[PDB]
Amino acid sequence: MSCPSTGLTEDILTHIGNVASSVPVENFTIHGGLSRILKTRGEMVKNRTVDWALAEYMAFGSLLKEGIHIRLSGQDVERGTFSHRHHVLHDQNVDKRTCIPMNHLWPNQAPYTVCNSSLSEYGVLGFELGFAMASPNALVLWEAQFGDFHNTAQCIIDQFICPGQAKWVRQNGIVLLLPHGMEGMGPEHSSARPERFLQMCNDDPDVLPDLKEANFDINQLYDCNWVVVNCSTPGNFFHVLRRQILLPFRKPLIIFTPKSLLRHPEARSSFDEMLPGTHFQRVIPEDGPAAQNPENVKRLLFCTGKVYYDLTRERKARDMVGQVAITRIEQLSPFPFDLLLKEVQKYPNAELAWCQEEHKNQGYYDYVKPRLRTTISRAKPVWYAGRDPAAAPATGNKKTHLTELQRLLDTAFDLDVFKNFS
Amino acid sequence: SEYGVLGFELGFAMASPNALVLWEAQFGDFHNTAQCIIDQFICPGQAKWVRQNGIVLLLPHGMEGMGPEHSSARPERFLQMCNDDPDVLPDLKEANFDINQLYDCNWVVVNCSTPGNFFHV
Amino acid sequence: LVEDHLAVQSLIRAYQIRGHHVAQLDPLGILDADLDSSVPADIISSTDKLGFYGLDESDLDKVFHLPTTTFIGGQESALPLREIIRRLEMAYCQHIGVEFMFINDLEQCQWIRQKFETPGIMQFTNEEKRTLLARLVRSTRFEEFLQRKWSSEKRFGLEGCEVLIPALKTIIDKSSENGVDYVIMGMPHRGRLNVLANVIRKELEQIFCQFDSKLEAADEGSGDVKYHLGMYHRRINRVTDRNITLSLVANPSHLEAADPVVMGKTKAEQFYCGDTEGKKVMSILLHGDAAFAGQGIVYETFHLSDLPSYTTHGTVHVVVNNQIGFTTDPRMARSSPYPTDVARVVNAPIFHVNSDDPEAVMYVCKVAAEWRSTFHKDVVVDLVCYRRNGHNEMDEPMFTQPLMYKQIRKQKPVLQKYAELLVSQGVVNQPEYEEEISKYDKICEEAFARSKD
Amino acid sequence: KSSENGVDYVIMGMPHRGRLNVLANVIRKELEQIFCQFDSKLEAADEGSGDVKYHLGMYHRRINRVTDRNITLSLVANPSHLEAADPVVMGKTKAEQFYCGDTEGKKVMSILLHGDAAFAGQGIVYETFHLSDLPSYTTHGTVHVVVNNQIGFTTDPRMARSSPYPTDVARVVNAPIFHVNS
Amino acid sequence: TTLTSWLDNNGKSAVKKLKNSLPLRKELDRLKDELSHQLQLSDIRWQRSWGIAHRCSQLHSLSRLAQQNLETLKKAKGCTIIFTDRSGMSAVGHVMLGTMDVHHHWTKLFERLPSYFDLQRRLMILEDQISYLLGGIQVVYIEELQPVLTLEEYYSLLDVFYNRLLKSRILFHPRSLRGLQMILNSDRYAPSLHELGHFNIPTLCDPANLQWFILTKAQQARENMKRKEELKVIENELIQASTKKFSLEKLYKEPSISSIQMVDCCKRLLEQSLPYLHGMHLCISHFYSVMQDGDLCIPWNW
Ligand SMILES: CC1=C(CCOP(=O)(O)OP(=O)(O)O)SCN1Cc1cnc(C)nc1N
Ligand SMILES: Cc1ncc(C[n+]2csc(CCOP(=O)(O)OP(=O)(O)O)c2C)c(N)n1
Ligand SMILES: [Ca+2]
Ligand SMILES: [Mg+2]
Ligand SMILES: [Mg+2]
């Protein structure tokens, strides 16, 4: 088994960008703030750069080109909980009149559906799961308002999506998008609980897949219950949704989408990661001044998602570029053993730390640590930098949350907290 | 119903500390229908709120090959919601370690194998 | 006339079973809350529809004899059909819509008909109008002050529904009259601070203290946001000579998930006080229209309401129907005419009231409080209102609902029009209305200095 | 009767009680295949963990005796958990209606079976009934069949509900109810 | 005549839907003939209604499969392909790709064609044996009158019937050669004579009862085989005449419609005229409906 490259030629991307930025109806009037958003979209498109909202158009339109039905359903998805996509436009003067710019991309194209559901997670998710098991030529997405409200549907997740292929032969490829990230928000607006999904995985930490296997991944994905991912750039988010369809088989996908990165100025990527011959990246290497002289680096930090942009700002503020190498992990699901083994080899002499946003008993630590310990022959103790354990997902006092973040960044770059112990 | 009755019992248990309120599940596998109540009220309730709750949950558990939904009450899900720190060895040499350790914890889990221990708990 | 009286019989059916489908419950003027713009052939809005019943224009003056299922006649035992239609239209097709004909107990139907059909029953004293005016002033000026001091925060204020505070106060006062001594409440995000400041008189100074950025928690716990905290306070009722304890239960953001918790706490308090029919402990719950009609736990709680060993002998539900969810049109949120139709599975009467007329809101709240004491059943009160600002104080409502908020921008607040109505009637004068606004502003400002200290 | 009225594809969901009888006659599954499941030395070829006989689905197409027209049947595999497969059946029906280019669901129909104790105590019934009519979720009609045997597991029906009949959620969406002495 | 009211109400939406649907029809024709040429398939067919939008997606998926694996797919020269709900090869040799299967499941099917072809010869030999047994009697697999049968199941039915019937008792006569066919019904009740002119006979049947049933109604069957064809011919001419009268792009039937019902249908259209039928797609069905892609369903009962 193999997967074709998911890249696209440039003219398709330009046409899709021009369509989304432009409004098909001259008569239609667009709110001045919405018009500024459409103008900024054009600003980016002419410069060959995509934000998070444009990557979703460039995935959905490219799939709709080759006759793939797409159904995006959820709770207030036509506009976005954080008001970032605006897939549906409303006339300010004429009542009940509506435009969907994604229905005008090409003359022969597959149907597109965006629907706002009732206030319910347990019936709507079941409805979508039933819709997704009637044909493999559709992409059904369920959107959660916050990642924290998914537990109301725990039954459906535990009984239908998790063991469905083992208990009954049927294959199903439903996609779940769950916003996630700790931003001084209320505890029920912070952490979509990735540690609960990561423990339902049927992977064995002690067992190691043979390094000498084809792709290794088209086989890691095949020998897995479902795929989980935490994307930090819009290019990877573009590639994942296309890989979900171009594969020979179907498996459920769990994406942990960001919240504050939807407007972060340096969280955007060029067209050069979407051109033909480009692949989804499970591990994003360390590219920078550190990779030029690897021996000089004394610490290697592995992170995931939103934390990255916090660590990079701290590293420059302390004049430690070239002393610390930061690496992102994008999949985590069928853990990537082969790529991560090379990163340890790249820096012979550097202590290994896992840096994390959440508390010690939540998040990705205690799933990642045995696996990272498995890749090495226990050569270096895998340390930890992050928040202390706590009962609640996040604190309700804003003042303590900032202090906690500051002490997290303090311990990450000390270079002697665990060095004296080792 | 598991989601309304468990909430009712939890509300009953927070009106006086001189009562013992027990909730029984038919099988330990049907508790996830009430996951919300377990995740937001029972688990972090004293961390977020002054009120303390002394409810007891009895969940039958054990793999007798009766099928996937009649086997395992999922103890690994309860054991990870604990606030205990794995990478630190407490001072074993202190008086009342058992009670000091028990005083700062979100809840207690137990898996009794003899009726005497079940009497004592 | 051999069988023409029959039509009049059926005539009354229509109103008592369908009048609420043509009542003027919406405050804006556009948007029918019942999602139905059609007018039933049963109801006579134009004289032509008399032909539906086999009657013409000449039948209006004939005199008809009323039955015992109507109390419109009052002293009179006979009426012209002219006056019959006039009385029935006032009784059900105005600012109050009553949904009660699905219950199969005659004594409960006669009680409701007597409460709502008799002429002149809804009469309010000048002192009652004065108290209502004061409460409305307080409810409005608190949110005004919150805007002036903290423009960026997400207050979730009650602009558009300012009659909720007097309604809750009236319910509690009538219950205290009927012997209740302990009230337990549960409530969602919308309007929490206003209730914490004006119903359960929590010290205003702590309310302002919570807003301070430089706040530490000296307790050893994670803590929770300002909209999730519990407050217990016992205060002497002004109108009653007795005291009352008011408790508000801390809830999480998950919607409607604290209903069974409130029921359980009420049951425990009733048990410990040796109360066999819950006569001295009462429960009140607040809901939103979108959550009340889409969550499953509402169904389970309503079913628990009556089982022995789980019943608490009556609850008063209050639904704030502002005709919008987060950004979702109410047409795509439910499959029933009203959000309050789960209440029909347990035979609980429903009273919808237009929240733009406070003097009917007060009467409906009083009647519900009396019903709970007389029959020990559930009762639901639906307040039809609107949402002036966005969901947050930073949402943009125009992107998704352009035409509705255009009407909202050109409508007066309830406090104003009530003030002019009172001044016109002579109950109060403009010098008195200005004095109260000024007094409430001195109390608020002094507290703010204490919070800064 | 539905086949008479033009239906060609039926999707069903059903609880534990009476599953084998329905598979043998209504779904017309082979008797030998049913008897084979009860054998203990049975092994499973699939790498799947497998599930119990009362949790497996069955698809079959056959000529109706009353109507010469062919009719296609489908039974959806569900867990032991009661009522949790109602939205799944609704979603599958909606997808089949969509793909066949059916605008008012005239050629695809859904049937659901319930028990009296579960139909009146689970929350998801309420949510499904509310989903039944919203545009973009409506499947244009469902036939619910409730088996009211007046008992739960060991629970008296008096302590199971607060309404005269188990079938009173149907009154919130204005659906007529016919009780019949079986 | 309620069809007049129904047409007057619903014609405009139909014409608009047709105008929207033309481009998808063009795309479907292009995809179909391109795929047919590339793999040298004899034909591509469908078994369910399905709309122009789902058929296009199925053709696109098959095109992607041919792009990825071409050598294995090339093993289907001269084999027609039908789209169904189950995979495997049919009773009369059709690759039945199934709508609910991923490419990994189809590729496995395309790698097992030679073995299925081998099994087909054994099945044909069994057909010849059964034919010579009872005197020349063609055993046929009439679709849309039997359940979808995969090659192995039909072979098993033929084998069990022949083995369990020949061993015990037998009667032979070379008559019935020109006509008389056997459906080989899968054991519903008992042998019966279908209206068309064939016999649906259960397996493992009693040879004595089978002989008594067959010997007595030869002439009626021979009469039915000619009635069916002459009604079919009068149908061809009537359906041509109706299209000439009303100027339809195409007029067709549901598979479940009996030919006599179409007799009556066309006959009671040809004496009436309707405005909106001009230049439209019409199909005979069991209900009043308009399809999403612009077709009208007129029941054969006004
Ligand atoms: C969509 C959503 C809301 C609409 C309120 O709609 P509503 O009841 O009509 O209340 P409103 O008068 O508009 O304030 S709030 C919060 N939320 C997210 C939300 C969704 N689901 C659950 C279980 N808990 C939540 N917290
Ligand atoms: C969610 C769930 N909780 C508990 C059970 C255990 N259980 C199996 S049958 C049954 C009784 C349900 O009553 P009813 O539907 O009336 O069943 P019937 O009369 O058909 O046996 C229960 C509680 C279950 N199957 N599913
Ligand atoms: Ca109306
Ligand atoms: Mg609302
Ligand atoms: Mg039963």
DSSP of C418-437: HHHHHHHHTSS-HHHHHHHH
The answer to whether the CB of C414 falls within 8 A of the CB of C354 is: no
| Distance between CA atoms of residues C236 and C239, nearest Å | 9
Say yes or no for a CB contact (<8 Å) between A108 and E27. Answer: yes
Query: Which among C230, C264, C269 has the least Cβ separation from residue B49?
Result: C230
Is C34 flagged in the annotation as binding?
Answer: yes
Is C30 flagged in the annotation as binding?
Answer: no
Looking at this protein, which amino acid is placed at residue A130?
A: G
Say yes or no for a CB contact (<8 Å) between B86 and A196. Answer: no
Q: How is residue A275 annotated by DSSP?
A: S
The answer to whether the CB of A36 falls within 8 A of the CB of A104 is: no
| Distance between CA atoms of residues C88 and C12, nearest Å | 8
Q: Which runs of E-coded beta strand occur in chain E? A: 44-46, 81-84, 95-98, 138-139, 181-182, 192-193, 199-200, 250-253, 281-285, 289-290, 295-299
Give the burial class of C252: count Cβ atoms within 10 A of its Cβ; 0-12 exposed, 13-18 middle, 19 or more buried: buried
Residue with tokens 């929770």: C224
Residue count (chain E): 302
Contacting residues of D for B30, CB less than 8 Å apart: 81
CA of B4 to the centre of ligand 2 (A): 17
Q: How is residue C170 annotated by DSSP?
A: H
Count CB neighbours of A351 within 10 A.
Answer: 17
Say yes or no for a CB contact (<8 Å) between A79 and C327. Answer: yes
Q: How is residue A161 annotated by DSSP?
A: I
CA of C91 to the centre of ligand 4 (A): 27
**Structure tokens that stand for A5 in this block:** 């490259």
Least Cα separation, residue B40 to chain C (angstroms): 7
| β-bridge pairing D143-147 and D70-75 | unpaired
Q: Inform me whether the C-beta atom of residue B70 falls under 8 Å from chain D C-beta atoms.
A: yes
Q: What angle do CA E83, E112, E41 make, to 5 degrees?
A: 45
Least Cα distance to D150 among D165, D168, D171, D170 occurs for D165
Report resolution (Å) to 1 decimal.
2.9
Does an H or E element contain A253, and which?
Answer: strand A253-257
CA of D161 to the centre of ligand 2 (A): 14
Does an H or E element contain C15, and which?
Answer: helix C4-18
Q: Inform me whether the C-beta atom of residue C223 falls under 8 Å from chain B C-beta atoms.
A: yes
| Distance between CA atoms of residues C156 and E175, nearest Å | 92
**Structure tokens that stand for A177 in this block:** 């998008």
Ligand 2 pocket residue status of D115, Cβ below 6 Å? yes
| Distance between CA atoms of residues E242 and A202, nearest Å | 64
The answer to whether the CB of E14 falls within 8 A of the CB of E281 is: no
CA of C326 to the centre of ligand 1 (A): 6
The answer to whether the CB of E141 falls within 8 A of the CB of E159 is: no
Query: Which among C303, C307, C332 has the least Cβ separation from residue D135?
Result: C332
Which residue of A75, A76, A116, A119 sits with most ligand 1 atoms within 8 Å of its CB, as the best mutation to test the pocket? A119
| β-bridge pairing C231-236 and C243-248 | antiparallel
**Buried/exposed A176-194: b ≥16 CB within 10 Å, e otherwise:** bbbbbbbeebbbbbbbbbb
CA distances from C159 to C358, C398, C445, E100 (A): 15, 17, 21, 53
Q: What angle do CA B70, B71, B75 make, to 5 degrees?
A: 125
| Distance between CA atoms of residues C344 and C367, nearest Å | 19
Q: Which runs of E-coded beta strand occur in C14-89? A: 63-65, 78-80
| Distance between CA atoms of residues D101 and B104, nearest Å | 62
The answer to whether the CB of C323 falls within 8 A of the CB of C384 is: yes
Query: Which among C224, C268, C269 has the least Cβ separation from residue B49?
Result: C224
Is C189 flagged in the annotation as binding?
Answer: no
Residue with tokens 């309310």: C207
Say yes or no for a CB contact (<8 Å) between E144 and D70. Answer: yes
Least Cα distance to E56 among E101, E26, E79 occurs for E26
Contacting residues of A for B40, CB less than 8 Å apart: 188
Kindly list the partner chains of chain A, i.e. chains with 3 or more CB atom pairs below 8 Å.
B, C, D, E
Least Cα distance to E285 among D96, D99, D7, D108 occurs for D7
Residue count (chain B): 121
CA of D123 to the centre of ligand 5 (A): 17
Query: Which among D57, D90, D92 has the least Cβ separation from residue A168?
Result: D57
Residues 305-344 of C with CB under 8 A from D: 305-309, 332-336, 341-342, 344
| Distance between CA atoms of residues A415 and A303, nearest Å | 17
| SS3 assignment, position D101 | coil
**Buried/exposed A33-66: b ≥16 CB within 10 Å, e otherwise:** ebeebbeebeebbeeeebbbbbbbbbbbbbbbbb
The answer to whether the CB of C118 falls within 8 A of the CB of C74 is: yes
The answer to whether the CB of D23 falls within 8 A of the CB of D38 is: no
Q: Inform me whether the C-beta atom of residue C228 falls under 8 Å from chain A C-beta atoms.
A: yes
Say yes or no for a CB contact (<8 Å) between E51 and D101. Answer: yes
Nearest protein CA to atom 10 of ligand 1, as residue: C288
Q: How is residue C101 annotated by DSSP?
A: T
| Distance between CA atoms of residues C389 and C366, nearest Å | 30
Question: Cα-Cα-Cα-Cα dihedral of E105, E111, E113, E114, to 10°?
Answer: -160
Q: Pick the atom of ligand 2 nearest to D83's CA.
A: 1
**Buried/exposed C164-194: b ≥16 CB within 10 Å, e otherwise:** bbbbbbbbbbbbbbbebbbbbbbbbbbbbbb
- Please give the annotated binding residues of D, written as ranges: 17, 116, 149, 151
Q: How is residue A388 annotated by DSSP?
A: P
Alpha-carbon torsion (C320, C324, C326, C332), positive or negative: positive
CA distances from D182 to A61, A374, C448, D147, D158 (A): 55, 64, 72, 10, 21
Q: Pick the atom of ligand 1 nearest to A188's CA.
A: 26
| Distance between CA atoms of residues D56 and D35, nearest Å | 15
Chain C meets chain A (3+ C-beta pairs below 8 A) = yes
Question: Cα-Cα-Cα-Cα dihedral of A190, A195, A200, A204, to 10°?
Answer: 160
Is A244 flagged in the annotation as binding?
Answer: no
| Distance between CA atoms of residues A407 and A358, nearest Å | 13
Which residue of C255, C323, C331, C401 sits with most ligand 1 atoms within 8 Å of its CB, as the best mutation to test the pocket? C255
Least Cα separation, residue A165 to chain B (angstroms): 14
Least Cα separation, residue E281 to chain A (angstroms): 21
Residue with tokens 């550190």: A290
| Distance between CA atoms of residues D132 and A246, nearest Å | 34
Looking at this protein, which amino acid is placed at residue C293?
A: A
Residues 116-135 of D with CB under 8 A from B: 121-123
Specify which residues A142 forms β-bridges with: A73, A176
| Distance between CA atoms of residues C373 and B19, nearest Å | 29
Q: Inform me whether the C-beta atom of residue A312 falls under 8 Å from chain B C-beta atoms.
A: no
Say yes or no for a CB contact (<8 Å) between C300 and B46. Answer: no
Q: Pick the atom of ligand 1 nearest to C156's CA.
A: 14
| Distance between CA atoms of residues E139 and C171, nearest Å | 84
Q: What is the 3-state secondary structure (H, E, C) of D14-70?
A: CCCCCHHHHHHHCCCCCHHHHHHHCCCCCCCCCCCCCCCHHHCCEEEEEECCCCCCE
Q: Pick the atom of ligand 1 nearest to C291's CA.
A: 8
Q: Pick the atom of ligand 1 nearest to A145's CA.
A: 18
Longest CA–CA separation in chain B, Å: 47
Query: Taking ligand 5, which is a single-atom ion, which protein residues have CB atoms under 5 Å away?
Result: D 115-116, 149
| Distance between CA atoms of residues D155 and E271, nearest Å | 67
Say yes or no for a CB contact (<8 Å) between E104 and A250. Answer: no
Phi first, then psi, for residue E114 (nearest 5°) are -55, -40
Specify which residues C318 forms β-bridges with: C286, C381
Is C382 flagged in the annotation as binding?
Answer: no
Ligand 2 pocket residue status of D79, Cβ below 6 Å? no
Specify which residues A178 forms β-bridges with: A256
Say yes or no for a CB contact (<8 Å) between E102 and A4. Answer: no
Query: Which among D130, D135, D160 has the least Cβ separation from residue C293?
Result: D130
| Distance between CA atoms of residues B96 and E34, nearest Å | 82
CA of C159 to the centre of ligand 4 (A): 12
Inter-axis angle of helices E218-246 and E207-216, to 10 degrees? 60
| Distance between CA atoms of residues A393 and B81, nearest Å | 10
Give the burial class of B61: count Cβ atoms within 10 A of its Cβ; 0-12 exposed, 13-18 middle, 19 or more buried: middle
Q: What angle do CA C408, C146, C256 make, to 5 degrees?
A: 70
Count CB neighbours of E21 within 10 A.
Answer: 20
Alpha-carbon torsion (D60, D62, D65, D69), positive or negative: positive
Residue with tokens 């056959």: D62
| Distance between CA atoms of residues D175 and D150, nearest Å | 22
Count CB neighbours of A354 within 10 A.
Answer: 21
Residues 6+ positions from C50 with CB-CB distance below 8 Å: C44, C56, C57, C59
